[PDB]
UniProtKB/Swiss-Prot annotation, chain A:
Pore-forming subunit of the rod cyclic nucleotide-gated channel. Mediates rod photoresponses at dim light converting transient changes in intracellular cGMP levels into electrical signals. In the dark, cGMP levels are high and keep the channel open enabling a steady inward current carried by Na(+) and Ca(2+) ions that leads to membrane depolarization and neurotransmitter release from synaptic terminals. This is Cyclic nucleotide-gated channel alpha-1. It comes from Bos taurus (Bovine). Belongs to the cyclic nucleotide-gated cation channel (TC 1.A.1.5) family. CNGA1 subfamily. It is found in: Cell membrane. Forms a heterotetramer with CNGB1 in a 3:1 ratio. May also form cyclic nucleotide-activated homotetrameric channels, that are efficiently activated by saturating cGMP, but poorly activated by saturating cAMP compared to the heterotetramer with CNGB1. The channel binds Ca(2+)-bound CALM1 via CaM1 and CaM2 regions of the CNGB1 subunit; this interaction modulates the affinity of the channel for cNMPs in response to intracellular Ca(2+) levels. Residues 250-307 are annotated as: C-linker. The chain holds residues 154 to 460 of 690 of the full protein.
From Swiss-Prot, chain C:
Residues 192-195 are annotated as: Selectivity filter. The cyclic nucleotide-binding domain (CNBD) comprises three helices and a beta-roll of eight beta-strands from CNGA1 and CNGB1 subunits. Upon cNMP binding transmits the conformational changes to the C-linker domain of the S6 helix to open the ion conduction pathway. The chain crosses the membrane at residues 4-34, 40-66, 79-102, 106-120, 134-155, 165-207, 208-235. It comes from Bos taurus. The record marks 219, 223 as: Central gate. It is found in: Membrane. Residues 315-428 are annotated as: Cyclic nucleotide-binding domain. This is Cyclic nucleotide-gated channel beta-1.
UniProtKB/Swiss-Prot annotation, chain E:
This is Cyclic nucleotide-gated channel alpha-1. Residues 13-22 are extracellular. Expressed in the retina, in rod cells (at protein level). Pore-forming subunit of the rod cyclic nucleotide-gated channel. Mediates rod photoresponses at dim light converting transient changes in intracellular cGMP levels into electrical signals. In the dark, cGMP levels are high and keep the channel open enabling a steady inward current carried by Na(+) and Ca(2+) ions that leads to membrane depolarization and neurotransmitter release from synaptic terminals. Forms a heterotetramer with CNGB1 in a 3:1 ratio. May also form cyclic nucleotide-activated homotetrameric channels, that are efficiently activated by saturating cGMP, but poorly activated by saturating cAMP compared to the heterotetramer with CNGB1. The channel binds Ca(2+)-bound CALM1 via CaM1 and CaM2 regions of the CNGB1 subunit; this interaction modulates the affinity of the channel for cNMPs in response to intracellular Ca(2+) levels. Belongs to the cyclic nucleotide-gated cation channel (TC 1.A.1.5) family. CNGA1 subfamily. It comes from Bos taurus (Bovine). The C-terminal coiled-coil domain mediates homotrimerization of CNGA subunits.
Length: 307, 230, 428, 230, 57
């Protein structure tokens, strides 16, 4: 009944719980800030919200039946597992995210999906997936760049939703910085709205100024805040890319450094050129055949029994 | 008056074409200095999160390097698939339950007094429980505590089998060993944590019966994490 | 009087003047060529600095530059005779003798400013002397980018002059200081050289990507130099922090009590300060053996040489003991020696003070020893478990002792029998 | 039709934003994706250039770390100023002539056969010029060549003094030693490359007069990279 | 120090901010100088390790 937190069922369940968490984090703000998505596709996101809630409950049950190792042996007792669950901040976060808040629909109307904003707390589970996958993937660099790109996409989408909400609050058409108008034949279509909001948010988070200049004080402050956020985002992106490239090239860099050390020594001490060719060919043979690492140092890492 | 100036300063630091041209000469100096200064700070902050990000994921980088080196070694050595999965599971266990760093390089810097204090805190009662080391001096027991060496095993691993040469004493810290027959089944006794074995063979005895030779095959049920004195 | 190219403290300062003059030329020649700032009201003052630049360039060909000690086969040549002919046959004289020949105008001094190696040598000296030398590289690349913009603005002013003030869209005028105008133009075009509805011609659109690439390359170099500088600055702090929380995680895993946890944290913090390194052996092993020996004989040689126990022995013995001395820091109120203990080691004091806690019922100071005092040497000539300590010795504060274990003494004695017989005679 | 398209592509992917704004609900997210690709591209160049400039400037970084560490140590322990100057000069000499990394560590990566061949190539003619090893088996001489150890020195450094244990032989590969009196001011014999003085002492001859005791003070007048056989 | 860094050039340049909030500026301004004096007092009452003894004179 108990599942190994290192096995394969746990990982696919991590995927299964990562799905609705991302769905909430992406759609709640979107269908709260636009009110044309919420109005049109009511039953779609009634069924989807029901599915997300039941998956959250199943995640609670799975975490009650997860299991841990004590004295090196995985625990298979229900009471101990339940007590271990009911001891961490994760249990409090999950309970907070699982409280029924839909009862405010009768109190606030069907135009307010922000009431389901407490579901934006299971994100740690999602994070856990993106950790476990990083261990189990074949080429980690592709996965990590995809994860970074997805994070940037989520942030840009949130910025677009916030910009549209601010534009609605100020009023469509009150100035040239706001969203143009909801009465145009094209701008009131919920496709033009979302795509133009994405375009504006992307153009604002990235190098600033290309969008129409602000008019009011709140817009002036919002532009500066978005510029700061975009600067931080781009710095994070370049730092991650630099770390990727350094990690990928570290092995070749160290092997090359070994080669230059040998070559410098053989240039210092006058060595016959034939032996220089021989050692260079030996190093090339080591590199091409993937035998560039020393067996002894490799085996040093392992424990004595496995060694 | 404040917010417009803040936005203008942001634009001047960031870009150079998003503001009306500096029609006065003294404004050109301000704009040029703003651009150079802003590019300076932007390079500085970008380098800052670059270095921080590189530092954040470095233990993972070395761990992946060790795993890749292991896999390459046992790829060009035609090691069987069972051993492949066993070592992969071992490294998975190491990363999952954080144990990548070893105890010997963690405390390699502390002076002998603090090492002795922490070591007698970790395991002194267990050593005092040892039959031979029971009524001996505190200085000797301190000398025998700093010489313990960690050894962590895996489920099914055999700590020692019958007929093997015994030159170690093993104290179970957090684990569960078992005395099995030569066939590996028919459990005889289960040694929980705090217990020990091979204490009589660690010291040479005139005319010992089973001289430096184990007399029982004992293995790990789960993970063992026991200490050894040579 | 041959001078030292390094650590002379005057050659570097004169290289500072020479590199300043070279920078003056390299930055003023484009301005004098493009801008008509060489007015009659300033021609004389500019040409006076030109004369001084010629004179300092001459000083960089002969005289002071003439004298320079070097090394051949390990031997340092400092006789003011042989490198008179070594310089004239060296590359330094080759890049000279053409950078000073007589030949305002752009081509007038472009071949007359080529000393790119003198500035590199000044760089090397600066990073050799200056401690915070990492930021110097980035300020160097900043000067490089500013010089690139300076050249890009001088070329723009030349193009405007050749095209006419008020001829095409991109030209400027000379109502104000045109230098800052052209600098602003160059900076603006460094990122803004595009535009679909403005097809200038087939020679401007094509190189816009080239200038954008040059800007991106310089910008990436900027970012890389920042990242390298930050890493070099924070490497030690990160290493110390990482060791500290690794120890803390270990001790939290093993449920170490709060008091000893505080003591080890105090040791970590106090050793991080005033040392900068968690242990000294890892530095010493990388050192050459003779350097280590000289360090040992210059740090704590006179203290051990006056010890009455090792009087009359040879020098290799005591040298090897000095090499095997291990440093240790004791916290305040720490029992360095306990009463009724083996007391095998031999401690010397290098910084701090220690007190012998005696008296009628203990907890009473009898005598305090200060820096330069050894104690416990009588135990180094003992046998296994035969030197039970007499009293208690406690460190008054944060003391710095040099321990020499008896086992190390035995290992050293293995190779010295003529001192071993003397030591055993003293013990007897 | 191609030049205009290429110009639009190179202006959109550099994120200049000098192109006409999208107007038809399909150009919008196309330009969004183009901006994303341009951001990723620029991140790629900056990361690649940073990694290249870091890798190309790594030896100087380690050397600067070692020099700052040793300077800080010698300032902390209050060593003599003259020794401070000596150590700084020795380190700058080692960096200038690219001798910073010790030969054992440099050659540790090579295989045993190649290392032995290189060792025979570099110093085996010199080991055949010593008086004791003139008529000797080449097989033993190969091992003797393999057993040589490098020793670097500094001006004014003393090699053996007098009345020492004298258990080594020194082969002067580079530099120039000197034989001086008890007061190191008068010079008698200035040795050169290829010479040797500790040949008899290592082979302890029965009945040797003044055995295993150096009989002359030898000091380095230059830097004198020597090789020692124990 | 934070107040004296980000709230002095905002009054030397925005003449309306001072003219409006002069009373608050005066109060915080006198408090800053009082704390500056107390800085001298504290700096005079800090020890320093001499051979690890933590001088308390």
């Amino acid at each position: 009944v108990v599942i190994d937190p290192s096995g394969n069922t746990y990982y696919n369940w991590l995927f299964c719980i990562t799905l609705p968490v991302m769905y909430n984090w992406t759609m709640i703000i979107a269908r709260a800030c636009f009110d044309e998505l919420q109005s049109d596709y009511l039953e779609y996101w009634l069924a989807f919200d029901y599915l997300s809630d039941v998956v959250y409950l199943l995640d609670m049950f799975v975490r009650t039946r997860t299991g841990y190792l004590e004295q090196g042996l995985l625990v298979k007792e229900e009471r101990k597992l339940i007590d271990k669950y009911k001891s961490t901040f994760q249990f409090k976060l999950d309970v907070l995210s699982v409280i029924p808040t839909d009862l405010l629909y009768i109190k606030f109307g069907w135009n307010y999906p922000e009431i389901r904003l407490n579901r934006l707390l299971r994100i740690s589970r999602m994070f856990e997936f993106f950790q476990r996958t990083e261990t189990r993937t074949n080429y980690p660099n592709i996965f990590r760049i995809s994860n970074l790109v997805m994070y940037i996409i989520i942030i840009i989408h949130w910025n677009a939703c916030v910009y549209f909400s601010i534009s609605k609050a100020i009023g469509f058409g009150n100035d040239t910085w706001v969203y143009p108008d909801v009465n145009d034949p094209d701008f009131g279509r919920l496709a033009r709205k979302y795509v133009y909001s994405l375009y504006w948010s992307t153009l604002t988070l990235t190098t600033i100024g290309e969008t129409p200049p602000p008019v009011r004080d709140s817009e002036y402050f919002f532009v500066v805040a978005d510029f700061l956020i975009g600067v931080l985002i781009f710095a994070t992106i370049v730092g991650n890319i630099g770390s990727m490239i350094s990690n990928m090239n570290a092995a070749r860099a160290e092997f090359q450094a070994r080669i230059d050390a040998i070559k410098q020594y053989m240039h210092f001490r006058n060595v016959s050129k034939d032996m220089e060719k021989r050692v260079i060919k030996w190093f090339d043979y080591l590199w091409t055949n993937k035998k560039t690492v020393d067996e002894r140092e490799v085996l040093k890492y392992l424990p004595d029994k496995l060694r | 008056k404040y917010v417009y100036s803040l936005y203008w300063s942001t634009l001047t630091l960031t870009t150079i074409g998003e503001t009306p041209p500096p029609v006065r000469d003294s404004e050109y100096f301000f704009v040029v200095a703003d651009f150079l200064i802003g590019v300076l700070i932007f390079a500085t902050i970008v380098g800052n999160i670059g270095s921080m990000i590189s530092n954040m994921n470095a233990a993972r980088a070395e761990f992946q390097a060790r795993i890749d080196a292991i896999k390459q070694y046992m790829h060009f050595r035609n090691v069987s698939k069972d051993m492949e999965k066993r070592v992969i599971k071992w490294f998975d266990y190491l990363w999952t339950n954080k144990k990548t760093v070893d105890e010997r390089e963690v405390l390699k810097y502390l002076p002998d007094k603090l090492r002795a204090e922490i070591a007698i805190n970790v395991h002194l009662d267990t050593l005092k429980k040892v039959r031979i080391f029971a009524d001996c001096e505190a200085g000797l027991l301190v000398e025998l505590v700093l010489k313990l060496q960690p050894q962590v095993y895996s489920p099914g691993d055999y700590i020692c089998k019958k007929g093997d040469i015994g030159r170690e004493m093993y104290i179970i810290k957090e684990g569960k060993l078992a005395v099995v027959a030569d066939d590996g089944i028919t459990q005889f006794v289960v040694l929980s944590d705090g217990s020990y074995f091979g204490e009589i063979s660690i010291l040479n005895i005139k005319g010992s019966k089973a001289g430096n030779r184990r007399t029982a095959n004992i293995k790990s049920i789960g993970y063992s994490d026991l200490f050894c004195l040579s | 009087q041959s001078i030292d190219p390094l650590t002379n403290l005057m050659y570097i300062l004169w290289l500072f003047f020479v590199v300043l003059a070279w920078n003056w030329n390299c930055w003023l020649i484009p301005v004098r060529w493009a801008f008509p700032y060489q007015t009659p009201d300033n021609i004389h003052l500019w040409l006076l600095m030109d004369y001084l630049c010629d004179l300092i360039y001459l000083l960089d060909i002969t005289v002071f530059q003439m004298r320079l000690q070097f090394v051949r086969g390990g031997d340092i040549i400092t006789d003011k005779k042989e490198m008179r002919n070594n310089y004239v046959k060296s590359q330094r004289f080759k890049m000279d003798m053409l950078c000073l020949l007589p030949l305002v105008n752009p081509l007038l001094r472009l071949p007359r400013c080529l000393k790119y190696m003198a500035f590199f040598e000044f760089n090397n000296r600066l990073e050799s002397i200056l401690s915070k030398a990492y930021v110097y590289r980035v300020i160097r690349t900043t000067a490089y980018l500013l010089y690139s913009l300076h050249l890009n603005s001088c070329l723009y002013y030349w193009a405007s002059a050749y095209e006419g003030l008020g001829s095409t869209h991109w030209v400027y005028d000379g109502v104000g200081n045109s230098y800052i105008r052209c600098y602003y133009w160059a900076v603006k075009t460094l990122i803004t050289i595009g535009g679909l509805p403005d097809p200038r011609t087939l020679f401007e659109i094509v190189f816009q990507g080239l200038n954008y690439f040059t800007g991106v390359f310089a910008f990436s170099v900027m970012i890389g130099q920042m990242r390298d500088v930050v890493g070099a600055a924070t490497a030690g702090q990160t290493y110390y922090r990482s060791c500290m929380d690794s120890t803390v995680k270990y001790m939290n895993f093993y449920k170490i009590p709060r008091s000893v946890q505080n003591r080890v944290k105090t040791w970590y913090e106090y050793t991080w300060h005033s040392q900068g390194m968690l242990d000294e052996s890892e530095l010493m092993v990388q050192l050459p053996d003779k350097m280590r020996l000289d360090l040992a004989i210059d740090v704590n040689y006179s203290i051990v040489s006056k010890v009455a126990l090792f009087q009359g022995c040879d020098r290799q013995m005591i040298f090897d003991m000095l090499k095997r001395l291990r440093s240790v820091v004791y916290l305040p109120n720490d029992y360095v020696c306990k009463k009724g203990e083996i007391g095998r080691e031999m401690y010397i004091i290098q910084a701090g003070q220690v007190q012998v806690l005696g008296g009628p019922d203990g907890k009473s100071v009898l005598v305090t020893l200060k820096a330069g005092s050894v104690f416990g040497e009588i135990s180094l000539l003992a046998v296994g478990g035969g030197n039970r300590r007499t009293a208690n010795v406690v460190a008054h504060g944060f003391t710095n002792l040099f321990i020499l274990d008896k086992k190390d003494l035995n290992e050293i004695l293995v190779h010295y029998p003529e001192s071993q017989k003397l030591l055993r005679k003293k013990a007897r």
